[PDB]
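pls ignore typos typing on phone
zinc ion + seq
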Amino acid sequence: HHWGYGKHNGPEHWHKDFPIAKGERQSPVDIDTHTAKYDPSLKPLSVSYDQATSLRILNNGHSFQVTFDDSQDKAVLKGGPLDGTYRLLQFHFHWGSLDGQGSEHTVDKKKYAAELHLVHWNTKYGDVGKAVQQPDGLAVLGIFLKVGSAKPGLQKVVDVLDSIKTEGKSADFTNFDPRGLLPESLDYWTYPGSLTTPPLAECVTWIVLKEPISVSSEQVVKFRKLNFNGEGEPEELMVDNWRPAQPLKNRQIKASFK
Ligand SMILES: NS(=O)(=O)C(F)(F)C(F)(F)C(F)(F)C(F)(F)F
Ligand SMILES: [Zn+2]
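k done
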């Protein structure tokens, strides 16, 4: 069993290969808005994506991702709850089979149709492999998707998905500007957590934006036409590629806003 999202290899099985799945700082979590504490010491988030260089778009059999040149400080996250500078490596999404599920984080138990993760690593560790071994190695910016109006800045992504249908396919994907995926407000919740896929390392400062973006039904339908399987294997729609909320345990979720 390679891990996945199915009955026999999904999230409830992951602890067998990755025992940290039952750890003290696992992600995602439910964000209980009434118990999150406003922290006036939290700084505004600094998102500097003007010089981003996208490279490729890839179906990895679990999601699709857009990868960036992370060999220089071109697209960086700073400020917020963070110390130092975090380079953008990639973004990807989690989504559902229907609009009432798909997000990893939840808000007062509400599930969104999808969740966008912009993955960044701390430059003090030099490379992402080293960063995942550190408790402050990664910063993932999470953005909820609800279904309504289209997000124009997402359309270039969805229009190429037919070229990466099955696991193992990739395409050139240059000049994509991730600023077109961001909501108006950068108000956020933050807490210490983990990767939400294997190896589930406890290396992430999570930053989850309060404001969702809206995407159209046609845009999310194109996500749902992707396949978990490789070409030639039985077709299994890439849907419900989300890990459920995990126990908060001894953690405090902090809000940047009142
Ligand atoms: N969902 S998530 O924690 O962003 C993640 F996909 F697991 C991930 F962090 F991006 C990751 F895949 F583990 C990696 F960091 F390797 F990119
Ligand atoms: Zn993710």
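Residues 1-258 form one domain. The pocket of KPQ (ligand 1) is lined by residues 117, 119, 138, 140, 195-197 (CB under 6 Å). more later
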